[PDB]
Symmetry: D3
């Protein structure tokens, strides 16, 4: 009957993503659970579907100047090279240099939740990230450029249904720490910063969360490489 | 140097329990974390140290009359025989017949937190538990007696330091649904219902959480066996 | 919004079962895959949803008379007490005394696939099962009664849509080795041997696979206990 | 070509056991390794091939009188009901009431290694095992009878090749704490206490370790059930 | 006795490989199993013995032009960087850009099975592989060269026992999509494309599968690096 | 109460390290255990706290000239690229090219144990490490420089309490195979080769093992990258 079709493989992927997100919906809509655990579904989705070089967790982000971010619903980060991940008071705290992306998880896409997401990503981009020069056989490379951390918002239901209306809420200065580079409203659309247009774009889509996943894969491919971290800038806090 | 001593094996166990509970302390005392995740440390401790027939989780408890408990910080239950454990909105919901013990987790032992613990265990004991007759080769056994569910309170710091004062707050009608049968304040003491004295007893102890663990092991040994559950009393809720 | 409802917990369970079975549908309907791996979905479902005392696998069944069953799509069995499970030529072979249930997996419920399922379960019930007397503190118990092995058929689409028509194909002598005791057509109905009516019953149901799961849980509860196996009756085949 | 044969399934099992034991041989024969880790192969074999109710480990055994066994190469024990297993100084220490069997691992079967094995099992049987009365719905059962702990010796090469000569070294008072109930020399034979003959029996066998495994399965089936342990007899050692 | 010898470490490795392949032999020779699962043994061997940067699975291979390979018995691929691996109808489908090697598994080395292997690898090399330019701190690197995918055949028994006769069947145009670069007949020999001779070479060897493993390790070392994949060339198939 | 402080996160890390090392202390001080398993605690610590690109094990090291090191208590090595790790006689044997660091584990820091550690690391640095030229798109890179293997000593109690006295025992020719580059005495201090001073430095520290961990992270960052290994130099030992 059915022969091999990439469109069917992608519909199957989308069906699995959609089924996992029903748990997010049920959590946010429950009068007792009230959204508890919702971000865990997205964390699990990213650990399932992203390349194995990436790890996802709910976490705080720290820097070597003793500054901390807000609690981040989903952080995508490195563990292959990263010198530490702190496990403290049942929380995870990740050095800022190891971070690729940060997301806020909400039920609905609207003005308040966009603002909330910007505050979260800004609290991560405000942190100081170290980067050492890199010795090699023929000399010393300049310090690696810092990762362009991806900021995003992950929601189920769009409450700004006109694309141009949503566009007006998403438009933001690309250089500002509160920039959102990607996001989705699973029932309706996804959005991203378009480097050609040099502007945010909203795409209505009937398989929005999977279109979002492919956009995220492409952005991760381009966001950079973790730096050689100044480990002693963190280690100096061991004693007064 | 050191030869084999059971007292040293038990001091080693106690040191491990005490080290794990520092995470509980740090969570409750943190101005941002504010106790988040604290019960997870106790859940992990019980899954480490209890016999493998027992499972521990943070969970809600349900019955076949569509009644639900409050959220329980630590539930000790059966998975070997139990017909289902629901995974809903990132929560676990356990049938009441599969429950052996329920605990409330707090930083401090005081009047308010005793009252809180009683309300939690009462919400579980109020549930209706089924028990079917048990056919066997020579006839039919009467339904298994229901488990005497153990209710408890798990804390770090005692704020009722006089044993007789704490006794006066713990005394309770053994037949009442709000009875607490066991508990501890890790820094000072543990307590339990003494079946010989027929009354609560407070024991000051320098290794209180490990003394508590041994008292819990003894109470679990005696609290009964899961019943043959009326599975269709739950299954009837599938359709209206 | 949503308060706690057992009907919602069961709808959530059903949604998860239904999502897993889409893989079975896609496998059977694919012009290259042609049903490969379909039974693995049901195996995984049973290992997820049955009590931990049960294990499920695709397997052959053997007896101590050197007789073997056909290949069984899903076998529910014991590993807690069972003296061996053979791992041979990438297949699993289970002693007959350790078996609780056997199922055939097909896309459709129709006459041919009922017949196929009967042949599979009959090949397991035809095997000789040992059972030793059981010494105890006060004497010796008679050998444990043999498990009433549950035979079933697991399908997605019903092609005998009239219940009375399907009934006429399912009716069978309860004592015969080809008896089917339970089954489902996920899109329409489930069926079982009703001990009160002493006859097969077909139940049209909008959540058929979950109604089936609860019927299976109830049948497993009653099908018996593994016997003390005559281990040397198997061990004698080691040498000629 | 090959049709289904239990003798072939058992030859396959035997081939796997034999391949695992080549590691034991290579360890004992190496001029640097000198037998290090040899018992780990047998531990792994038992955890692979015994029913899941059994656990195997290298361990010490303790009792509630603060007495300890020698280091035991392989202990078969319970974790399902057992109130504790101590993890101390990278060793495991198991309460005596939870023990089913104890084995000594050596390269060769000879007089010295039989004597060594007897000293090891005697150090376990000398321990005091508790057993409480067991309350039930209709009264109180007498304390469970203590397990008849199986003592054994596991070797690769027989240096007492005449069965009657080996018999003369194995004969022992069945009631004495140094009794060996089972053992093998993988290249030649296995041995066991025969309850009918009321005497040790040596069986020359070309698949000796697998014949041994089946004899062990049969002995485990009959050696008894763990008792209700006097938990407070251990807990009293927490403080002086 | 035995001191440290690399030849003994390699004989030990070879003994383990040979023991695992007895399962392949027993599967192919069984009148019911008829080779079912045989490739799983090789998959497991490669996941055990290859560097952790490599993954092995039975799988199909897809490209961004919606073209699919035949079913491949063993695919060696990347998961560290790869943007997706599809899990569809209980099959795995891997993007072509992530593939390092593909193998056909058969009982015997003969003309028909060489032809079969060529058809399988040709179906993978026929696929279109993308490769994007790679931005870096000082400019943009040309797209990464495509991996020289290794094609092979894995068998137990050689039926072309004369090396020059087997050579005549293996000789092939190195540039053609049906080229086989490596293979083995475990009982007799392994073969490979020799870059110095610029021709296939057959090596009779008494430890052929381990010699093959070392040749495979060397070929993997040289076959290239996964490209920056054109993720949107796959993502465009999400919608029509 | 407590707000976010990197010093508190690092104190928490240190508390966990200190608790794990109590097992090392208890092992070395026990009259029966006598240090058995002590290195396993450090192995576990490194697998917990080092970046995932590193693996730690107790192991021997081998080279392609058939030369072997002494048994090394803790080896830090690569598995991502490494062509083999031998599993022989329950030991691990690692090719020298894959090694980053080697450590000796002792209870006390004193002259004899420094000497012991030097002999261990010298036995690894004496091995021959291969390194092939590396083809690339534009030519062929010279062979990768060999890793500067880190040699160290891990102890609990300092018996050379004067830093200048300990300095006099640690001073060593940086180019010599017995150089120790890092170490700690958990109760008092850690030490390292200071590249600026070009000399060993001893640092008294109240959180010495965590200061050591950060120094180790920094040294690992700089010690180099595994080479392209001459796989056939090892494979030639397969046959005589």
């Amino acid at each position: 009957a059915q022969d091999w079709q990439l469109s069917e493989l992608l519909e199957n992927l989308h069906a699995d993503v959609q089924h996992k997100l029903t748990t997010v919906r049920k959590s946010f809509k429950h009068s007792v659970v009230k959204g508890d655990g919702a971000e865990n579904v997205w964390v699990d989705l990213f650990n399932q579907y992203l390349p194995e070089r990436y790890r996802a967790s709910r976490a705080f982000v720290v820097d070597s100047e003793n500054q901390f971010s807000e609690q981040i619903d989903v952080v995508i980060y490195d563990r292959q090279y990263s010198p530490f991940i702190f496990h403290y008071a049942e929380q995870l705290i990740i050095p800022a240099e190891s971070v690729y992306a940060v997301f806020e998880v909400k039920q609905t896409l609207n003005k308040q939740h966009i603002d909330a997401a910007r505050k979260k990503v800004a609290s991560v981009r405000a942190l100081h990230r170290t980067s050492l020069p890199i010795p090699h056989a023929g000399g010393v490379h300049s310090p690696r450029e810092l990762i362009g951390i991806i900021g995003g918002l992950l929601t189920l239901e769009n409450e700004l249904k006109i694309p141009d209306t949503l566009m007006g809420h998403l438009d933001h200065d690309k250089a500002d720490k509160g920039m959102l580079n990607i996001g989705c409203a699973a029932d309706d659309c996804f959005f991203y910063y378009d480097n050609d247009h040099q502007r945010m774009q909203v795409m209505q889509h009937k398989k929005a969360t999977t279109a979002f996943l492919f956009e995220l894969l492409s952005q991760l491919q381009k966001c950079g490489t973790v730096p050689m971290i100044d480990i002693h800038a963190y280690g100096k806090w061991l004693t007064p």
